């Protein structure tokens, strides 16, 4: 403690030259001791905490530690060409990103600067990166569905608009097929999607963006992409700029969605940054502020009350586990923050059950408030029958009461497993979902063939979409499973069964 950073010889010589005078270095700071994700600056007497500073190379900074003689700024990039002794300039602005309606269709590098190669983005500068979350009087109970396009999610883990639903699983177990499925299913609805890639390899970000452009989802989607070769500061800060971009649309009465891919990677970047700043770490070397890191980010996903324009932001954070370790540190942090999780499982993913939702350990704390009348009425029986299957397949290798259980498990459970599985990047509309749950869990799909279930269901889907336009009208009009839709679907599935028997 007997040594400082401002005790270099030039600063002391300039102090000795004139001791008492008037004008200090107002906006002119000289960098000294460029370190590891930090740079200490003598000067900047009137800088603010949270202020952006600009270096001679062009690197942006943020004044974090404002000590007595020097301010310590955190480098927002590789601080490689920061010459020692070079000047630093404040900007007078707390950390912001330009926001606009013209970000839709662009790819971002956590600084609201495009890595797209399609020129700059016009905007009107606002929307501080660390915006405050809504209060208690500001928001409202969740009451309308955000249809993800997956039968299992929409049927047993319903997600509403304004709800923080976590996607927790192992590596290569889904979660990005699920995230991109939810984004691509937003074609007709007025939902501004945002995809944040925090630590993904740049090839996976390329795959996701080309899938989006191919299927037409970039007319309402922004992509904030931080690759694995990026500084830990940018990976740390990318979801906050994603949340600010989405909040710009949220506070203008528009419904938004945001997916933070690998928030565990943001926590890993925050761990690297704290350890390089020598802060005392807790369990698994995490800084202890990692709960606050995640909570102040996820607390922005709200459902604003009618006075605040009735906007919303749904958050689908993604957390990876090590060999399915739900009881780790960062998974339990995000579980204690969010409003329910969606467990993907490596055994069911690798074994072929391809949307590998571990339904018995996933919840959603909105439920019936999220689901519409039709899906509630149809999927009650579905979750009951799947519950029964969940203990049958585990405990009973063949069965107890082998005759009724064969009428129970073979008819309901093992065919509902093939009913729930759904290909990569193929969402379903809510009418097809209601129809598919009805044809399965009522008892109609109890005498098929285990490899012919899929073909029967897809052909029945296209058939009802082609020869029954009034069922889709009466489900898209009231969102309720009336007796008329029920009866016409019954005779339509008899028609389709006798068509497909040939």
């Amino acid at each position: 403690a007997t040594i400082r950073a401002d005790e270099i010889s030039k600063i002391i010589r300039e102090r000795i030259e004139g001791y008492n005078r008037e004008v200090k270095v107002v906006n002119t700071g000289t960098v000294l001791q460029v370190g590891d994700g930090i740079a200490r600056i003598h000067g900047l007497d009137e800088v603010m905490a949270g202020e952006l500073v600009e270096f001679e190379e062009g690197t942006i900074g943020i004044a974090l530690n404002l000590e007595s003689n020097n301010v310590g700024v955190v480098l927002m990039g590789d601080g490689l060409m920061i010459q020692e002794g070079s000047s630093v300039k404040a900007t007078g602005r707390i950390a912001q990103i330009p926001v606009s309606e013209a970000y839709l269709g662009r790819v971002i590098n956590a600084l609201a600067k495009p890595i797209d190669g399609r020129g700059e983005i016009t905007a009107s500068e606002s929307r501080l990166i660390e915006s405050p979350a809504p209060g208690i009087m500001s928001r409202r109970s969740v009451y309308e569905p955000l249809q993800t396009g997956l039968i299992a999610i929409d049927a047993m883990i319903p997600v509403g608009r304004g709800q923080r639903e976590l996607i927790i699983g192992d590596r290569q177990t889904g979660k990005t097929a699920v995230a991109t499925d939810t984004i691509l299913n937003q074609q007709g609805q007025n939902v501004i999607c945002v995809y944040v890639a925090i630590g993904q390899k740049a090839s996976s970000v390329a795959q996701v963006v080309t899938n989006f452009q191919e299927r037409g989802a970039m007319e309402y989607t922004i992509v904030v992409a931080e690759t694995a070769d990026s500084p830990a500061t940018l990976q740390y800060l990318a979801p906050y700029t994603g949340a600010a971009l989405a909040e710009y649309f949220m506070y203008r009465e528009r419904h938004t969605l945001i997916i933070y891919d690998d928030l565990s990677k943001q926590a890993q970047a925050y761990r690297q940054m704290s350890l390089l700043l020598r802060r005392p770490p807790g369990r698994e070397a995490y800084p202890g502020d990692v709960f606050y890191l995640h909570s102040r980010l996820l607390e922005r996903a709200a459902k604003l009350s009618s006075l605040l324009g009735e906007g919303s932001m749904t958050a689908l954070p993604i957390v990876e586990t090590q060999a399915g370790d739900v009881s780790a540190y960062i998974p339990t942090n995000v579980i204690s923050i969010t409003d329910g999780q969606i467990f993907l499982s490596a055994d069911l993913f690798n074994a072929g059950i391809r949307p590998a939702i571990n339904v018995g350990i996933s919840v959603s704390r909105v439920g019936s408030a999220a689901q519409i009348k039709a899906m509630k009425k149809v999927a009650g029986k579905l979750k009951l029958e799947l519950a029964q299957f969940a203990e049958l397949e585990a405990f009973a290798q063949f069965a107890s009461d082998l005759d009724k259980a064969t009428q129970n498990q073979l008819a309901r459970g093992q065919r509902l497993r093939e009913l729930l599985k759904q290909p990569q990047s193929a969402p379903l509309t809510v009418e097809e979902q209601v129809m598919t749950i009805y044809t399965g869990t009522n008892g109609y799909l109890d005498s098929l063939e285990l490899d012919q279930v899929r073909k029967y269901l897809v052909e029945l889907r296209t058939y009802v979409k082609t020869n029954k336009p009034e069922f889709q009208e009466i489900i898209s009009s009231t969102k309720t499973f009336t007796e008329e839709a029920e009866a016409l679907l019954k005779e339509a599935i008899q028609e389709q069964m006798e068509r497909f028997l040939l």
Partner: protein, 481 residues
Amino acid sequence: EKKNLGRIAQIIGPVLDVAFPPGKMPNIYNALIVKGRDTAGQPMNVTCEVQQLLGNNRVRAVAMSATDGLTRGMEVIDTGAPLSVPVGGATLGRIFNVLGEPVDNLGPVDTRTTSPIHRSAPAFTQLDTKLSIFETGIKVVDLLAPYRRGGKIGLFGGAGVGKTVLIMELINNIAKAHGGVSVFGGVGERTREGNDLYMEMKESGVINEQNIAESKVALVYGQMNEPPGARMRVGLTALTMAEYFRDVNEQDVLLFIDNIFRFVQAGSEVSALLGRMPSAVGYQPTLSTEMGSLQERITSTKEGSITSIQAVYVPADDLTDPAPATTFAHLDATTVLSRGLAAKGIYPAVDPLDSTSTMLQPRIVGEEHYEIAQRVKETLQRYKELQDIIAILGLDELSEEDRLTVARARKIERFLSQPFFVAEVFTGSPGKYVGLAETIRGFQLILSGELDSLPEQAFYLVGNIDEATAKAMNLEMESKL
């Protein structure tokens, strides 16, 4: 690059502190040679890399060589560039250290082209978004665990299974099949194993010693005798030599790394020496960034493609340790090498069931290829489950579908063998290249009942199922005679 002369201020192990003129000091990741003095009576220079700027005209470096015999006040020469290694066809069939110096004693290499080892990855726009299948010409790898062009592959086979023969076959096949070249990077290479590998590469024709620059490989060696600075940066030196062959020449390059765990190990060593606070299980706090800054330059641009085949060591045999867990965030496929299959002579000894791949999907490989690969996996798995029952009951007391399954599985397991171009030198068989099309057309025939009246020793050690039928006819002529 000029008269930017430094003076050593501290020598604490392989970590130096250099003092400089007040206005001119190097950036981070910048080479600086220490114009040192050997005690024997000759000068000898030591290369270091800037890691941190410390304040009053003082940086902190990490030596690529040893720091014994260095005094405080030696002249340190700033160079204005990162570590610069020679690149091009001049680095072919030769052995290099981390600094790009030759250590094979064949002579000097002409520094006509020198690229820096510290470089940003290709841009998001310059990346290729296509999912191509790298074809190795090896039946088991192409069929059951396909490779990706621009992706990374983890070797998990222990010592003694056909690993070195496998990478030599991959080198020879990427040279003869495609127009590609290979770059071997030995992170923590044992010196006697390095000499054995170089001799076997000279002998197998991979390193054409009668005429260098006709060779198919460039060797970079960061050895265990070397300080933790060299052992960490040797992977970047190898990746730069491979990136030149991609960028300028537009080839399909094959970047072989030795244990990428020793890359992480050298990184944790240099972080412990520089004094940074350790991460979770004691690794460096910059673990994921240190790994990603390497792995993100192994991609496929619009010009060529680097495909890396990295040996992976799992400490304490768990895949949740941070070095395996952060390596597996970049692996696209995985080949495990079987001690049992190497014992019973099924070279190449790749385990068919424990080898995985994310390329094996219908959208990427065709529904035909996917379905036949899944059927082969089911057949081999059923045989593996049924070996105990066949040991108890026998093949006769089984059922008919199970018996045909067992016979087809023995034929498939022997068909996963291959005679290698580089293993021919002691085995004698002429060695075969089998594309994927002949692989799937041969497995369709061996799986549907078109080739069931054949001996099991007819499919063994052949390629290209027509050769299996021909050797079957010869093995039947052995009976007729």
